[PDB]
Design an enzyme around this catalytic site. Structure first.
Site, PDB file in Angstrom:
ATOM      1  N   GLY A   1      -4.338   4.984   6.607  1.00 41.50           N
ATOM      2  CA  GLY A   1      -5.068   5.890   7.613  1.00 41.50           C
ATOM      3  C   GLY A   1      -6.212   4.817   8.725  1.00 41.50           C
ATOM      4  O   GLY A   1      -5.832   4.753   9.881  1.00 41.50           O
ATOM      5  N   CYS A   2      -6.700   3.511   7.669  1.00 41.04           N
ATOM      6  CA  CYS A   2      -7.634   3.154   8.510  1.00 41.04           C
ATOM      7  C   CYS A   2      -7.102   1.974   9.653  1.00 41.04           C
ATOM      8  O   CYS A   2      -7.739   1.479  10.160  1.00 41.04           O
ATOM      9  CB  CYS A   2      -8.647   2.047   7.009  1.00 41.04           C
ATOM     10  SG  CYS A   2      -7.286   0.788   6.684  1.00 41.04           S
TER      11      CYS A   2
ATOM     12  N   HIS B   1       1.237  -1.422   0.123  1.00 34.94           N
ATOM     13  CA  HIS B   1      -0.111  -0.096  -0.008  1.00 34.94           C
ATOM     14  C   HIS B   1       0.795   1.503  -0.387  1.00 34.94           C
ATOM     15  O   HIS B   1       1.188   1.856   1.168  1.00 34.94           O
ATOM     16  CB  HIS B   1      -0.509   0.084   1.183  1.00 34.94           C
ATOM     17  CG  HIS B   1      -1.866   1.257   1.194  1.00 34.94           C
ATOM     18  ND1 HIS B   1      -3.244   1.423   1.174  1.00 34.94           N
ATOM     19  CD2 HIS B   1      -1.313   2.701   1.819  1.00 34.94           C
ATOM     20  CE1 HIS B   1      -3.433   2.492   1.476  1.00 34.94           C
ATOM     21  NE2 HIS B   1      -2.322   3.146   2.138  1.00 34.94           N
TER      22      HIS B   1
ATOM     23  N   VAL C   1       3.244   3.658   2.378  1.00 31.76           N
ATOM     24  CA  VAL C   1       2.843   4.662   3.189  1.00 31.76           C
ATOM     25  C   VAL C   1       1.608   3.743   3.858  1.00 31.76           C
ATOM     26  O   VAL C   1       0.378   2.860   3.753  1.00 31.76           O
ATOM     27  CB  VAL C   1       1.895   5.951   2.049  1.00 31.76           C
ATOM     28  CG1 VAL C   1       0.435   5.806   1.474  1.00 31.76           C
ATOM     29  CG2 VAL C   1       0.803   7.318   3.400  1.00 31.76           C
TER      30      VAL C   1
ATOM     31  N   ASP D   1      -8.663   2.098  13.139  1.00 31.80           N
ATOM     32  CA  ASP D   1      -8.293   0.310  13.766  1.00 31.80           C
ATOM     33  C   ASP D   1      -7.397   0.331  15.600  1.00 31.80           C
ATOM     34  O   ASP D   1      -8.327  -0.041  16.429  1.00 31.80           O
ATOM     35  CB  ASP D   1      -8.281  -0.841  13.393  1.00 31.80           C
ATOM     36  CG  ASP D   1      -8.653  -1.968  13.921  1.00 31.80           C
ATOM     37  OD1 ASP D   1     -10.100  -1.527  13.963  1.00 31.80           O
ATOM     38  OD2 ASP D   1      -8.357  -2.610  13.917  1.00 31.80           O
TER      39      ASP D   1
END
Lengths: 171, 170
Positions: free
Chosen positions: B83-84, B74, B80, B88
């Site tokens: 963000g998810c 990713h 990077v 979490d």
């Protein structure tokens, strides 16, 4: 922005080519690859379609019991992390911007309200993602704003309002 | 309520691994995820009367190195941290805090009110910090909190109204 005669669906092979930066132009935004790719196919793409008449994309993930996240989240209590369904929606917003011809590298910029009201378990068959665009902004930063739904086996289990994604010329 | 809780102010990586195996809060409390879904290496601080609403403050860290699994996939050519996964981490910390207080059940993130990403975690970063300020704790066990993610001391994500519940029957 001159791109026309667009495809309305994409196969797993196409999505993997996208991860390699080899589906659109080399300048287009790639999908994630490997364990961060959260769909198998895009079944529908419509410019100016969807709930706001500003763009629609529908995609699917086959829920195989061997999906990597089931083994570790949680041990002996498998459930797909909601965050990965959320990311799938962000990725589809970015992909749609590239599908229109937008150049750059994608970054999720945020989301409004997200509700997880159900779960994706290994015994599920299929997750469906529905993305309804509200804004497509072709500026120096290309930006998409959309509402999203995640369904499992045909029932809505997540909603997300105001998904925002940008394509950056330079990160 | 769950009386079998190992309740301390900080937790090491070994403690987090034990949590993934259900050994920190026992059979009755919420385990953390394990393996490639565990998004922190330690909990630096947990203060029961702390934070913006005097209802709880939690701070945790993830050490960054270029070989973390998500960087490779990713994205290809543009690593990077998603963000998810930082979101979490924060959801997991809310569930963990509920367990720490003696809450019974398995955690499930319920959603979030608003999330803003104004920066990114690159493979040459050194540390990600999570800061959680609890706003409501209901002991129908659930928590409502605000969260911030920093990379190398700089705020890059904010999340308001993170919500997590504990479920005895998932």
């Amino acid at each position: 922005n001159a791109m026309v005669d667009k495809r309305e669906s994409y196969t797993k092979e196409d999505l993997e080519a996208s991860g390699r930066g080899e589906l659109f132009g080399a300048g287009g935004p790639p999908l994630p690859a490997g364990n961060m790719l959260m769909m198998d196919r895009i079944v529908k793409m419509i410019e100016d379609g969807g709930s706001h008449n500003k763009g629609y994309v529908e995609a699917e993930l086959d829920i195989n019991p061997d999906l990597w996240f089931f083994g570790c989240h949680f041990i002996g209590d498998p459930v797909m992390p909601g965050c990965l369904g959320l990311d799938a929606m962000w990725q589809l917003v970015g992909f749609y911007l590239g599908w229109l011809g937008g150049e750059g590298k994608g970054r999720a910029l945020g989301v409004g309200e997200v509700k997880f009201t159900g779960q994706v378990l290994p015994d599920a068959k299929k997750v469906t993602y529905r993305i309804n665009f509200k804004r497509v902004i072709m500026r120096k930063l290309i930006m998409g704003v959309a509402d999203g739904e995640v369904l499992v086996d045909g029932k809505v289990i997540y909603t997300a309002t105001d998904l925002k994604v940008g394509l950056f010329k330079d990160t």
